[model samples]
Target: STKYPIVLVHGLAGFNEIVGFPYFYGIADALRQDGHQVFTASLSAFNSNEVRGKQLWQFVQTLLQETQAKKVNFIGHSQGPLACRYVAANYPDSVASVTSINGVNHGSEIADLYRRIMRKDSIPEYIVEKVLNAFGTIISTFSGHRGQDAIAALESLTTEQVTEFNNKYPQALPKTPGGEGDEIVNGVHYYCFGSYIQGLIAGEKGNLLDPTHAAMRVLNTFFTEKQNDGLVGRSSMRLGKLIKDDYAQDHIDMVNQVAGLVGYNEDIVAIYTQHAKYLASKQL
Candidate 1:
């Protein structure tokens, strides 16, 4: 077993599990089955990093009690990394490592587009937020959480807000703006890995219509001049100690989402398994 248990944090609008569907898909079970300790933690379905990060802080406090370790290795995807960043910055000693999978280490142009479209205080904004809030609340409750703040979630993800957030929590972040951050900060190891995945609107052949795939198709226009994993950009995915950012997988594929439709070129689970082993090798 690794020196610290691996704790998986799911991304925006993500859940640990709902009726057997897992946010990290089959990742947690795989690691635990392999003699490693792992567990998935869920924050608000939709909320800002500070909120979710506080939730993570709370989660970890309880986690350490039952986990038999002084620290945990945090592996987060998408917005989840921001939360982990918050934790590592505020409480570094509790975190042995931070790994980001397609993380929004930097803000996304896609979020900038959403910020523009959701005109503040506009009737359309109100209408859309109401709907999203309801959806987020339902998703949260279904995942055994109470709070849901979609607008805060949206605002915090914007390029502007993320920059502001990064200013506050700079640990494990890239130093030269697109380059890798420190391999370790305040005793916390950092690692990142992701892909720039894109597929047609109809979803891969034989698979049923995927709403997220369609959404990615529509949203990808924002990144026409750049490489992105449908939602987050390629360079922004970089965090500490860059692992392999060139995987042939998409935003959803990073977590093996859309009913496990991932790139044939790679087995998503294997990469995570290898990362756990890598941590073990380092005694992290």
Candidate 2:
């Protein structure tokens, strides 16, 4: 049996019930059924982990106080993973371990490209970052403002204005083996899982992003092909530990089992169950 609680951290544009059954309801239910206490902490849906981490820290602290659990386990997806890392790094006593699921620990070239392209054309980089930050700020008041400030803080990081950012905050969690990532934070137990994506899935192919599609095809990109939860690169999901790689799964598909031609049911269940086992061990 485990002594700590399991907390779920969701990534970009993620809502608790985006797909009706709860974006991660399946995984949560599975964990609970296996006798694990579970909680999903809400973030701005967009922004950086620093902001989210701060929010998570406050939340988990309150949780620990209420439940009287000295330590907790964190299972984070994408930004969620980063949030957990920050929490554990800063407060190892409060957090036992961190499991990153399809997390972008090394950051994403795709996000960089998006920022470059968008900032240069329609909106300036500063303005776009400010806008996104503002949007996050608005959302934060409602759900506890987890990492909205840190998300907005990326504005300084995105630009050539290096001195200020470098002086104040370091990009990425200062990890040992991860480079800026791929390295485990010194005090925390780091883990990961990799899911697959099907290229032929109609839902994946369809008409998503025009230029994005062409660029991706030219790049000979693999992983969950075509569509991926609208964001997150599947290949990036492979970062960290080697877990089961599901080819039929996509980025968004990780939320729950999608039926019909586009979804892979058994693989989805396996991902969750395996993760449950990882947590079950109480490894950290």
Candidate 3:
């Protein structure tokens, strides 16, 4: 277990504690079993990183006051990582380290495709916003967050916006793969790793477990066959240490899905357990 508390931040359409769903699934309980302090931030399911990051900062303040910890370590998955990056960049004092898993650091191609398609429709901005506002209201009812913005969330995930974000909040280490260097600032450490779902065998375009994920995996092939966790490519997932390049897990599988229909060859629970141990060894 680490001396600093660990906070798990979720991706888009995320929730901390739903009736039957867990954003990080068994990972939180697994960390606690290892005698680590853990917390999950509850924020809008869909909103721009800045908006959600602000909410996380507020949550961190409350967490610090309650736990009496000087700083917390953050582990973020998918869009979750981007929001955490925002916090770590702007509020370095509140964070000790950040770990990204299957993150979308360079933006997701799906977002770009969606944006291009939506633009071809020639939809007005206000109309899109109005529609999203209505959908956000419904999502907010279930999420317990008053304000939600799915459109903004989608926009932020696009290539252009994420590029802007990268310029403003560049990674501590080099962005490219196999880069040699550590980009720690203000005593905060950074680490990253990612997973992929490339079908039962290689050179095949199929995911036997999840049909939705299978479809996304196929779409991702258009982006890169190198490796991806259904939603994000391996290249984009590399941020800091680039611990593990590949795990046979899809985007949702990384969090251990709510339905329990999919899984990896290795025990996902053990992966998290070992990660906590790794952090402990570093005395983080």
Indicate which candidate wins on TM-score. 1
Which 10 successive residues of model 2 have the least lDDT summed?
Answer: 207-216
lDDT for every model? 0.75, 0.54, 0.70
List candidate 2 stretches off by more than 4 Å: 12-14, 17-21, 121-187, 196-199, 202-230, 238-240, 257-262, 282-284
lDDT of 3 by residue, 85-196 (tens): 8888898888988888777788776566557546667746654554444444435544556662244556777778778887888856464553522647667788887787
Q: Supply the TM-score for candidate 1.
A: 0.83
lDDT string, candidate 2, 5-66, tens digits: 88888654345444334546467777777777888787664455577778889889889998
Pull out the clashing pairs in model 3.
172-183
Whole-model lDDT, candidate 2? 0.54
lDDT of 2 at 91: 86
The residue-level lDDT of candidate 1 at 43 comes to 71
Q: For every model in order, what is the number of clashing pairs?
A: 0, 10, 1
Model 1 agreement with the true structure over 1-284: per-residue lDDT tens digits: 78898999965444433535788878888898889988777777466778889999999999999876799999999888989989999999899999999888788776665565565534365544444444444344335556523445556677787888888998877778668888988898999997885455344542234335444544555574367876788888888998788875667777876556655545788889999999999888
Name the top lDDT candidate.
1
lDDT of 1: 0.75
Candidate 3 error regions (>4 Å): 12-19, 121-152, 173-183, 199-209
